[PDB]
Amino acid sequence: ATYPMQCSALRKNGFVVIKSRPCKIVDMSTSKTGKHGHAKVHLVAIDIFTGKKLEDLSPSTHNMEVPVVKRNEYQLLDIDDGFLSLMNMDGDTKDDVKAPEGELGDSLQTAFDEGKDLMVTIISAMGEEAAISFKEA
Amino acid sequence: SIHEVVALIEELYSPHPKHDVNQIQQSLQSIQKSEQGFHLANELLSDDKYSANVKYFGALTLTVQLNTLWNVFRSNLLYLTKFSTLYVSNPNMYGQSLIIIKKLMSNLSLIFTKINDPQNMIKQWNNPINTFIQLMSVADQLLLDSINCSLTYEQLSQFVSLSQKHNELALTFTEVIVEDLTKFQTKRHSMSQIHEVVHEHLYISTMALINLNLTAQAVFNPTVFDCITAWINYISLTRRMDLSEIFQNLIDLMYQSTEGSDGYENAEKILTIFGNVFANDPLLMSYDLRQQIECIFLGNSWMLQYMNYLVTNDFFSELKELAICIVDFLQINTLSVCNKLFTNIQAADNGQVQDEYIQEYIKVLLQMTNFPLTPVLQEFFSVRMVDFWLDLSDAYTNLASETLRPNSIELSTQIFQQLINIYLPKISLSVKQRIIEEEGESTSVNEFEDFRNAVSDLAQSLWSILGNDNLTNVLIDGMGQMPAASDETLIIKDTDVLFRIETMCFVLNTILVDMTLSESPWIKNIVDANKFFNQNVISVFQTGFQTSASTKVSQILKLDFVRTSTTLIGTLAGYFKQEPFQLNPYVEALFQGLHTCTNFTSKNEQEKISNDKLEVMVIKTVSTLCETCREELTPYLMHFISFLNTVIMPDSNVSHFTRTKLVRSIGYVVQCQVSNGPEEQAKYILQLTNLLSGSIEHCLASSVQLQEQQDYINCLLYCISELATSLIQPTELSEFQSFWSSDPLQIRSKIMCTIDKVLDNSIYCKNSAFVEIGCLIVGKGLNLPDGEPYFLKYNMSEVMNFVLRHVPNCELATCLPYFVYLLEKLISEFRKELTPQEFDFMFEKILLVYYDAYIINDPDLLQMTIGFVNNVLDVKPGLAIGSKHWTSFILPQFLKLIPSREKFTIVAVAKFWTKLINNKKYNQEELTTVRQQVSSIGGDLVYQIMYGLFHTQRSDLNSYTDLLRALVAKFPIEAREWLVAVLPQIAGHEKFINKLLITRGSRAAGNVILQWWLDCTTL
Amino acid sequence: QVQFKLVLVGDGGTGKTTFVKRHLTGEFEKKYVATLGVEVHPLVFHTNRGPIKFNVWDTAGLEKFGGLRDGYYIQAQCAIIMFDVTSRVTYKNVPNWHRDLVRVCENIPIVLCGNKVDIKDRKVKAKSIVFHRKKNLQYYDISAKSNYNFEKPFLWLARKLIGDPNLEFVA
Lengths: 137, 1019, 171
Ligand SMILES: Nc1nc2c(ncn2[C@@H]2O[C@H](COP(=O)(O)OP(=O)(O)OP(=O)(O)O)[C@@H](O)[C@H]2O)c(=O)[nH]1
Ligand SMILES: [Mg+2]
Prior knowledge:
Chain A: Keywords: Acetylation, Cytoplasm, Elongation factor, Hypusine, Isopeptide bond, Phosphoprotein, Protein biosynthesis, RNA-binding, Ubl conjugation. Chain A: Its main location: cytoplasm. Chain A: This is Eukaryotic translation initiation factor 5A-1. Chain A: It is found in: Cytoplasm. The structure holds 3 protein chains of 3 kinds. In chain A, the strands form 3 sheets. In chain A, strands 9-8-7-10-11 form a 5-stranded antiparallel sheet, covered by helices on one side. Chain A has a 4-stranded antiparallel sheet with strand order 2-3-4-5, with no helix packed on it. Chain A has a two-stranded antiparallel sheet with strand order 1-6. Chain A has one helix at about 100-115; strands spanning about 1-5, 15-20, 20-30, 40-45, 55-60, 65, 70-80, 85, 95-100, 120-125, 130-135. Chain A is elongated and about 65 Å long. By secondary structure, chain A is mostly beta strands. Chain B starts with a helix and ends with a helix. Chain C has helices spanning about 15-25, 90, 95-105, 150-160; strands spanning about 1-10, 40-45, 50-60, 80-85, 110-115, 135-140. Chain C is about 20% helix and about 25% strand. By secondary structure, chain C is α/β, with parallel strands linked by helices. Chain C has a single domain, classed as P-loop containing nucleotide triphosphate hydrolases (Rossmann fold). Classes of the chains: A mainly beta, B mainly alpha, C alpha/beta. The interface of B and C includes residues 29 and 183 of B. Bound molecules: guanosine-5'-triphosphate and magnesium ion. Guanosine-5'-triphosphate binds near residues 34 and 35 of chain C.
């Protein structure tokens, strides 16, 4: 689910665990107190699910958790009481994923009520799964 | 009697008729359809001496065919007869006679839909256009039989176009038939095969006729444009119909349309057609034609010539529609542009031939995004481009990490920073200044605010890409490294930098809202590196607040500067907690303005409403700062309470809203005084309680309450509510618990007796506002996390005696939902200690006694009672099930309320039975009793469902589906037993749903249900 | 004394009868009574240029109770299409009612009205409306319960039918 990686090797685009939450790093800064003193990296990131801004300042050679972000495609077959019942290409149905909010969920309930074929790209990081992107042919 | 019919028909359309319009209308509905109504209509149309309005009513009287198989044939003959009659009088010289022409088209379209349905007989029409063609060739009644179903070729169809009105009638006929098929498809979906009939015959004739209008010059008529859009709408709603060559010839026609040749009239109509396709169903156009659209829009070039024609002639509305069409076209290629830009997974490799094409592609898009001619007032390209760049930002954020280009972050930073440099002067307040100067207080101001809100969300999506140093630090260092006002009192004196700093303050605010300034040390590092940042922020507030409003433009801009400044100060409350010494200059600057808008009484004359808006925005920021900086604002507590004692006086120049938020601000500071123990903090709480309750009792017993005293008492009651909410411990010990449980200062006793003194007056108890705020204060301590030492936490007997006290003397219509909602809070709080006998006591006193008189005939009180029972089922079903009125009152009453005529009442009753059936919190004994009771009233229940489902119409079918799904899933065996009895009462075809619905089980009903409603509706 | 003919159309349950009753008697009807046929009522507005009498024809949105259904549109001088923002079906049928009006009349001023804006859960966003791009078409968010934008539709119709955009109802 998560793997350790040195804070100095953290990318400005990759993902990292901050305050037990997966977050996509939006900017990476490094600072030093003294020339003989050790440095420290200051990371700022957007929460990959809630969208909140989380940041952490930690010294170098320190290990940070990096989550395994997966983007999967499921055809939307039902919307039951705010829960997206999707269909995998292998024939399995997942109704545990809730319907997203905002214009994303509004466009999902709109296109699903119209009857069009809807594919949903869902992002699973650590223990949370939520619909992200939509595709129609 | 026909002369009498024409008399009241002409009387119906007269400007000021005699006797009555409603009665002659009802009498007109009485003449039809009866055995002479059909014949009356034919005589109204065959007579040439009748007026056009009388003949239109004849076509309307013909339209009533819903009242067996032979009368349809006898009608369609006379439809086509009166058709050919008026359609021959048109093309020579009649004018303004095409109104009845269109109505007869609508009637024939309904005939085409009804006859071509599955069910001596009649064979399908298949093609009304051809039948209309040969009817213009004049042993007599025998012609219509063979002309109907089989007709001539296309060469003779072109021969019909010898005149112009002939082509107009054919174009209008195809349009009306399509538009009616669209209305019939949108109304109810029982078609499924008529589209195939249109696809096999009518589609060919319309495409050959439309393409003939596009290719041939003499046959070309501008009416085909309105006909193409109609066909495109019908195709976009149903489904392969090509339309590819139509788009090709429309592109050739649009490109040929210039100022000298056509005057850009056809180009405008074709752009409206393309704008409809791109905005609704862009996939209807193939990739090749979209490539031609790209080369025409983006290219001297033809698009540049048309844009210069609109700009030089000052045609801003048509230029706005042009921007909408181009943006909607580019929005469908968002994923392709984002991929070919920032990722390496595309068609071509090792070029890079597409990059220099796409680097110029984005460069031209940025030139169009900038686009001279200031926004809203003139152009909308930048306004609509906001949604395009927003989709590109979300697409870039959604790209995979391993698929990004090496220069992806650099190219994204460069492009999106140029967007910031473009849109910052775009949302500049100088644009709104010119809008209010030129157009005044028009809708362009509202569209400019929507433009600023759209760019605000654009920046919120761009921050995840540019980051803090490339987006946030650019704004902070831009206004933090230079002083906006060198002279004291912070007067900018300069308009350009004032607009620039207000734009930067608005964008910085919307970006910082998405942050958390407490957990972040970065905000302290960037602000400490800017000496004049906070000085310039207060400079914006003081410059706008102290700006004298001479005209209406300076007045509205004054409200805008204060709004942006006060909002940013409220957002910086987290940074003020990290940097307390910078908080002092803000509080003084706010209270100085708060006094500036208080001690002055010059009101000529609507300046007080702008004064009140400023006073509201100031006290809102003070409430926001006190909400986060409760601890840092402790030294100001002794000053604020003193200031409160002067504001709470009945004689003052402050508004009632600022009084409430001030008490909320003082309560925010008192809430953080839990250090020295409950005794020192209760000194402030008792002082505020005695001040609020003392002023209430002072106002009630001296100056007999008028409308002014009602607003003052309501203000102080809301102040007690704000004090109760502000004293709630934030979600972000036993000494306070034992103290407030005993409350030696009698805080709850003084507040409760104060609310009682207000609600004991007849002028207040029957007012909904005082009952609403009364139930809010009493229910403040309810549903709070246990263990929190809340001061105003009331037990069950106190809230019970409160509702029982004021419910009989109040107005039951408007004040009951507040008492019931207060009861729902008490039920959820004391769910552990509640007793079914106590639930019956609340149900009888508050609801049952007032039911048969005030509730049963009131929809609001009805949904109120249903929502109350649903809350009990959600919290503790054992209270409602073990009720004495469960089987005697609750079940029979809610059974009758199933086929209600109100939508919200339907959803309320449907949710009740759905929760009653699908409840998972039932005990094993409770589940057996529920299944027993549902089986007892199941027959009556399913009858009420189908009764409501039959008598209802669209948009309320789904609310029944969720109900029917649960009843079939939980009781599948008795479902058939209850359907075979309820269906024939509410014909034989209904049995079809039984097999098809129970087979599904759940999750795809409704689709089976409306195919039953569609059947059982026509009959 | 100048009068104009107003035709009020829309799907059933959009608050058409409640809207005209709120402007006539000032009362809000809570119960839903489906209008049978048409109901024509006068509404007087005293503006700076005198009195204006709008003959408002509240039509029936239901296919069953429609009555003449389009005979009410004859000699119509202005029209108001009303939909429900809480019901998407009511908004998708706006082009249907607009088409039946453009079939009878040609360029009469038509006002679009999304009712029940006071509802917290709104299923029709204000940004989705693109029908206000026409000179004779204008949209207004109205609420018959809270009187939000109460006299706005009648004011726009008065400005189009007269030609004085500075005229307002201040009576
Ligand atoms: N909350 C809320 N409810 C409203 C509002 N306006 C109307 N309603 C409700 O909507 C229901 C619709 O009533 P009608 O006016 O008869 O509906 P209609 O549009 O006239 O449709 P027909 O009667 O079939 O012609 C009424 O019972 C009102 O209670 C509103 O502004 N807010
Ligand atoms: Mg009505």
